Amino acid sequence: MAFRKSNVYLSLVNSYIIDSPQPSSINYWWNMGSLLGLCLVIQIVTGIFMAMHYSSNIELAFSSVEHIMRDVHNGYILRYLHANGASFFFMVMFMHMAKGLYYGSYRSPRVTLWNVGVIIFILTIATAFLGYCCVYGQMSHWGATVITNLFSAIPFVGNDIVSWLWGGFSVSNPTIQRFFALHYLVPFIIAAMVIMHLMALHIHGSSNPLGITGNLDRIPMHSYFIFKDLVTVFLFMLILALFVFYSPNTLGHPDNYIPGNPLVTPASIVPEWYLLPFYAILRSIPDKLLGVITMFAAILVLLVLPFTDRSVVRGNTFKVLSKFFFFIFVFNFVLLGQIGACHVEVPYVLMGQIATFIYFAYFLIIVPVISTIENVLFYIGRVNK
Amino acid sequence: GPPSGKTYMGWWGHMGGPKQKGITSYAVSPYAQKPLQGIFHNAVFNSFRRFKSQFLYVLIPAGIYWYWWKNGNEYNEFLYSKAGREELERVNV
Amino acid sequence: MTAAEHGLHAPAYAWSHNGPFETFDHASIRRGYQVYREVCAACHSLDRVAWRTLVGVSHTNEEVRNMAEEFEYDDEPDEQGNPKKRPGKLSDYIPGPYPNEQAARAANQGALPPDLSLIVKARHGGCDYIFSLLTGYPDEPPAGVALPPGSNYNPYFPGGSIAMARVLFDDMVEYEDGTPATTSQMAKDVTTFLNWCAEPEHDERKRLGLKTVIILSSLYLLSIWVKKFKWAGIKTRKFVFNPPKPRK
Amino acid sequence: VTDQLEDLREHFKNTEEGKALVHHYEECAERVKIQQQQPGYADLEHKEDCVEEFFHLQHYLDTATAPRLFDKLK
Amino acid sequence: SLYKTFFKRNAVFVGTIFAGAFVFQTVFDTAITSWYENHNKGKLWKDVKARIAA
Numbered sequence A: 001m002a003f004r005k006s007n008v009y010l011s012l013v014n015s016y017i018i019d020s021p022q023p024s025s026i027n028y029w030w031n032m033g034s035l036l037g038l039c040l041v042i043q044i045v046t047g048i049f050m051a052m053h054y055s056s057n058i059e060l061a062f063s064s065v066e067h068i069m070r071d072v073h074n075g076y077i078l079r080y081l082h083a084n085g086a087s088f089f090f091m092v093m094f095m096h097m098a099k100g101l102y103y104g105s106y107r108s109p110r111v112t113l114w115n116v117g118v119i120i121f122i123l124t125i126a127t128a129f130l131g132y133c134c135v136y137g138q139m140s141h142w143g144a145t146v147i148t149n150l151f152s153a154i155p156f157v158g159n160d161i162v163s164w165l166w167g168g169f170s171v172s173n174p175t176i177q178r179f180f181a182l183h184y185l186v187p188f189i190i191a192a193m194v195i196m197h198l199m200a201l202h203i204h205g206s207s208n209p210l211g212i213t214g215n216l217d218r219i220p221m222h223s224y225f226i227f228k229d230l231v232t233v234f235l236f237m238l239i240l241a242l243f244v245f246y247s248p249n250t251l252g253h254p255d256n257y258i259p260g261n262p263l264v265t266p267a268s269i270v271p272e273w274y275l276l277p278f279y280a281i282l283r284s285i286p287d288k289l290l291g292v293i294t295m296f297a298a299i300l301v302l303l304v305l306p307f308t309d310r311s312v313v314r315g316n317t318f319k320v321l322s323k324f325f326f327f328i329f330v331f332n333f334v335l336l337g338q339i340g341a342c343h344v345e346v347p348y349v350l351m352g353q354i355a356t357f358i359y360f361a362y363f364l365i366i367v368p369v370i371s372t373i374e375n376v377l378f379y380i381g382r383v384n385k
Numbered sequence B: 001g002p003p004s005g006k007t008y009m010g011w012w013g014h015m016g017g018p019k020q021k022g023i024t025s026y027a028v029s030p031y032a033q034k035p036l037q038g039i040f041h042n043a044v045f046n047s048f049r050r051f052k053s054q055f056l057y058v059l060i061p062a063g064i065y066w067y068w069w070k071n072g073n074e075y076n077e078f079l080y081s082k083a084g085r086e087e088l089e090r091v092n093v
Numbered sequence C: 001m002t003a004a005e006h007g008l009h010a011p012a013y014a015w016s017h018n019g020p021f022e023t024f025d026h027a028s029i030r031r032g033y034q035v036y037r038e039v040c041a042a043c044h045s046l047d048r049v050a051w052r053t054l055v056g057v058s059h060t061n062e063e064v065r066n067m068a069e070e071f072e073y074d075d076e077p078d079e080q081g082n083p084k085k086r087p088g089k090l091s092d093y094i095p096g097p098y099p100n101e102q103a104a105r106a107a108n109q110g111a112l113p114p115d116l117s118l119i120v121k122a123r124h125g126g127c128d129y130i131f132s133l134l135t136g137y138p139d140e141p142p143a144g145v146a147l148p149p150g151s152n153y154n155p156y157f158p159g160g161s162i163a164m165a166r167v168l169f170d171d172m173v174e175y176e177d178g179t180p181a182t183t184s185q186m187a188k189d190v191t192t193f194l195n196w197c198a199e200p201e202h203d204e205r206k207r208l209g210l211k212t213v214i215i216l217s218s219l220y221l222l223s224i225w226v227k228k229f230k231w232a233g234i235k236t237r238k239f240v241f242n243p244p245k246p247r248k
Numbered sequence D: 001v002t003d004q005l006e007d008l009r010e011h012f013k014n015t016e017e018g019k020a021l022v023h024h025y026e027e028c029a030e031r032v033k034i035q036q037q038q039p040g041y042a043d044l045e046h047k048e049d050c051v052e053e054f055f056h057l058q059h060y061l062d063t064a065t066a067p068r069l070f071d072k073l074k
Numbered sequence E: 001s002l003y004k005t006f007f008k009r010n011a012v013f014v015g016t017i018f019a020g021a022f023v024f025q026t027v028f029d030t031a032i033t034s035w036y037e038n039h040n041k042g043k044l045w046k047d048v049k050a051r052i053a054a
């Protein structure tokens, strides 16, 4: 046999990116998982080169980011690629998860593949929170104060978790020095879960946009999907370069260019755009302990989805009512992000409470009811009795 | 090594579908074809056929959520103006 | 909230560095440092800017050496261990008017004027907000507003009550090149100089962005052609079915 | 040579929309002037100002002046 | 054909790809810098410096 099939290390490369049998009819939505591996490489490489010039003390953290922007050769390129590359990492991940919702990729036999991807999503939200606090701007101090005070509502162990998370009595010097050391480590745990993600993909393969079997017509990976991957890689780099070089501060807040101050409160405290829908779910529950449970249950409700889908057909391609309610869930997620960037005022309080209900009623009420109705309409439209 | 649990995909030669008999296929080399003969009719006629089949499943949910946001934004602007001061005191109790 | 609590919206002026192919006007950065030294520097520090970064941007090497040598800096101590002083050099930073922030509030009736090294990036509005603030002081407040003693009215400030009085008046600065120094002329020059203080990489960044966009948009068009060539055999494939005889 | 922004704000204040918005602000200012002379101005929590009519005039002046100011500045 | 004059039927070899990439970088850097400074003439420091001395 060939040397790429008999060598111990080259056989893993051959079985994954060269000779891997792919379904013939997959479209450009199946190219988002390849872009997520490129995003993780850009974040690790640009972050290691920036970490050679960074100081994590409470009186040196803000000025060392300014030292990177002014004194380091091409240091403004390193930071803008890193800050805008995190927003591009979350936009491709939202499109990757919504492809699996539309085409039924969560279903059996790919349940273990769906469950490992939920763990990856939680670790990525935690990584972006820890690195945002390392700038120590005015948005970094008050965003860490709001999140860490949520754990003081847990009964009998509230005040012990929050003091152990601070290293003191407030957000101080020990808080920032331990947030930077944890920020270096969690991207390497994400890289180990990506390997476990690809091992579960290998035993069953990919799905296709028709929802039926693909074992009748396969083509190999090399020279079809290697060169189809190159089309979306060059389009990704071109849109990212237009943000890094021509508009580098559009996706940020101006208050993060003020050094952090524990004695002055900003007028508005708002997260980045990719954390805004989960911030509006938290502010809609008036109780303090029930708000923290509900914000974490908005991520863990994706695990109940293999059990509430009652359909005998995989995917939304031939389903009329499932297609209509998919786009209700999509535009409800955009309205939750817009509500989370407003003030707590009439009528935005009631609008965020109804939209939080529609988020949870999709997974638990709407999907099992209309799956059963579509099963019976397919039956009585053909059988003559 | 030992074998593992059963799957639904195989490899080249034993992929795992039904048996095939009676189907014949034909192809032609890419070096013998004229380059890019779908740059005009596919971009105008075919993309219009794919667009208008799927545009009512997207624009009817999009118009519901845009009408809802626009009335809530215009009512908040009235409550904090000068003319909406006695309505602001009674919706805040 | 109320529109007075938000502040008035700043309009859009036609700055000559707006646009993807435009640099700063370096004759307006040089004119804006003169308005900084003679007007702003009585109460504002510029702490992130070193003397050496001005050479080749707005002044020559011989000019900046004479500007730095008018201030006094701390030296290494004596052989007996006593402190010492020295004039400035090119590696020093531009000094501020106050020793600490307790002394800054005492000279400004309790208010603290901020550092102006990043003030363009740290406000919503950018260059348009700073220009509208300095030229937007009315001669009288509108009827009904009650100002605390020691405050002034400006509709572009959130709340409408600011602790800075109007500073810019006509012909308070005599320009070197002969430009008439009106209120709007001097307010345009400080805002161009202060945008350079926040973004000194701005001219170089827009030239490396022109090389990157041309190369990456050529690679994008070449990869569409190569993909359609290699997929041409799959896209025109044909299938025929003749049902087998029932011998079996 | 005087201020170029003060001459353009003076010019657009004498057009037809400019004279209408000035007149609306002045009839606001007189009704606040004929109160504050009545006994009862100690504390009311419903004291009226004319900020909103002042914001309407300034927004029209900025839309007319900002596209054509920097052509007159060196 | 113009492609037949240099390669006659073949693809471009990897030695010519690396050799022509370095020739490309110096020509592209000079043409971009020359267009950029002509588009912004009168605003650079080398134009202002020639008026405080002349």
Ligand SMILES: CCCCCCCCCCC(=O)OC[C@H](COP(=O)(O)OC[C@H](O)COP(=O)(O)OC[C@@H](COC(=O)CC)OC(=O)CCC)OC(=O)CCCCCCCC
Binding pocket: A027, A028, A029, A087, A088, A091, A092, A231, A232, A235, A236, A239, C224
């Ligand atoms: C923060 C910013 C991050 C941006 C990251 C961008 C990274 C790349 C994202 C690419 C992507 O989103 O693709 C997913 C989806 C693809 O849907 P589809 O209808 O194209 O596929 C059908 C068929 O395969 C085409 O097949 P087609 O015949 O069009 O292929 C040939 C095509 C290839 O060109 C491409 O690059 C396709 C991506 O040639 C041409 O188009 C000639 C052009 C001159 O795209 C769409 O459906 C378009 C709507 C996306 C909605 C996103 C909303 C959030 C912004």
Ligand SMILES: CCCCCCCCCCCCCCCCCC(=O)OC[C@H](COP(=O)(O)OCCN)OC(=O)CCCCCCCCCCCCC
Binding pocket: A029, A094, A095, A097, A098, A099, A102, A103, A209, A298, A299, A316, A317, A330, A333, A334, B050, B051, B054, B058
């Ligand atoms: C933790 C919770 C996570 C929740 C994640 C949810 C986040 C959603 C964020 C937006 C992601 C994009 C949403 C749409 C994703 C589409 C997924 C998909 O596969 O769509 C399939 C559909 C293809 O349709 P067919 O396969 O039937 O064939 C017709 C092709 N012409 O393709 C289409 O019809 C596409 C039509 C255009 C889609 C319009 C979506 C607009 C979204 C804009 C959001 C930006 C607002 C600022």
Ligand code: HEM
Binding pocket: A040, A043, A044, A047, A048, A050, A051, A054, A065, A079, A082, A083, A086, A089, A127, A128, A131, A132, A134, A135, A183, A184, A187, A190
């Ligand atoms: C999955 C990978 C990563 C993500 C999503 C991520 C995310 C972020 C974000 C959002 C910021 C704030 C950016 C800003 O607003 O300025 C940040 C800052 C930072 N990150 Fe990362 N990061 C990742 C990996 C890394 C790694 C592996 C390192 C170090 C080896 C690193 C080093 C830094 C440093 C030093 C900062 C300091 C502030 C700055 O320079 O902007 N990052 N990170």
Ligand code: HEM
Binding pocket: A029, A030, A031, A032, A033, A034, A036, A037, A040, A093, A096, A097, A100, A103, A105, A106, A110, A113, A114, A117, A118, A120, A121, A194, A197, A201, A205, A206, A207, A208
């Ligand atoms: C850094 C993060 C991730 C990486 C590198 C990654 C990578 C990949 C790759 C390469 C594929 C191959 C086929 C394809 O592109 O569709 C894939 C498929 C898949 N991924 Fe991810 N993924 C990530 C995150 C996620 C997340 C967040 C989820 C879900 C919550 C998820 C769930 C899935 C599923 C269900 C499939 C199979 C889809 C199908 O075969 O139709 N992954 N992933």
Ligand code: HEM
Binding pocket: C039, C040, C042, C043, C044, C108, C111, C112, C113, C114, C119, C130, C134, C157, C161, C162, C163, C164, C165, C167, C168, C190
């Ligand atoms: C051309 C000259 C000046 C410029 C461009 C300038 C610039 C600024 C800016 C941008 C702000 C912040 C506004 C904001 O935070 O929204 C500010 C605030 C302030 N300035 Fe100046 N300044 C100048 C001269 C002066 C002078 C001469 C004084 C005092 C004698 C002064 C005292 C203050 C004070 C006290 C504040 C704080 C106001 C407050 O927080 O309410 N400034 N200045």
Ligand SMILES: COc1c(O)c(C)c(C/C=C(\C)CC/C=C(\C)CC/C=C(\C)CC/C=C(\C)CC/C=C(\C)CCC=C(C)C)c(O)c1OC
Binding pocket: A016, A017, A020, A033, A034, A036, A037, A038, A040, A041, A044, A045, A048, A191, A194, A198, A201, A229
């Ligand atoms: C659809 O089908 C596909 C498919 O398209 C693809 C692409 C893949 C390929 C694989 C991926 C997309 C996953 C990508 C792999 C990762 C994300 C691994 C994690 C990334 C890393 C571990 C990056 C490592 C980087 C470093 C360690 C930094 C190196 C340090 C430097 C350079 C410091 C330099 C210091 C000095 C002094 C010079 C598939 O497996 C696959 O399924 C069959």
Ligand SMILES: CCCCCCCCCCCCCCCCCC(=O)O[C@H](COC(=O)CCCCCC)COP(=O)(O)OCCN
Binding pocket: A006, A007, A008, A009, A010, A012, A013
């Ligand atoms: C957690 C992540 C780790 C998992 C990654 C697995 C995949 C790794 C990808 C590696 C890419 C290929 C590496 C080169 C392969 C060639 C090695 C080789 O020829 O085998 C050896 C050469 O020995 C070496 O020098 C070891 C190389 C160490 C590589 C260090 C990176 C000789 O080949 P061999 O005779 O064993 O072939 C057997 C055929 N029956």
Ligand SMILES: CCCCCCCCCCCCCCCCCC(=O)O[C@H](COC(=O)CCCCCC)COP(=O)(O)OCCN
Binding pocket: A111, A112, A115, A116, A192, A195, A196
């Ligand atoms: C560099 C990375 C190296 C990777 C090394 C891989 C080995 C490390 C893992 C060690 C084993 C620990 C996990 C085993 C737990 C059993 C998992 C399981 O039962 O599979 C799943 C259920 O678990 C999940 O959904 C995902 C769990 C993710 C685990 C995250 C750590 C069940 O799979 P099942 O065998 O039932 O297949 C379906 C047949 N009906």
Ligand SMILES: Cc1cccc(-n2nnn(C)c2=O)c1COc1ccn(-c2ccc(Cl)cc2)n1
Binding pocket: A125, A126, A128, A129, A130, A132, A133, A139, A142, A143, A144, A146, A147, A269, A270, A271, A272, A275, A276, A278, A279
């Ligand atoms: C409140 C506030 C204000 C300003 C900035 C920021 N913030 N912090 N980091 N980034 C990028 C920001 O924008 C925030 C945090 O917003 C949110 C919303 C949900 N989370 C969250 C959920 C789970 C976990 Cl484990 C960690 C955090 N955080």
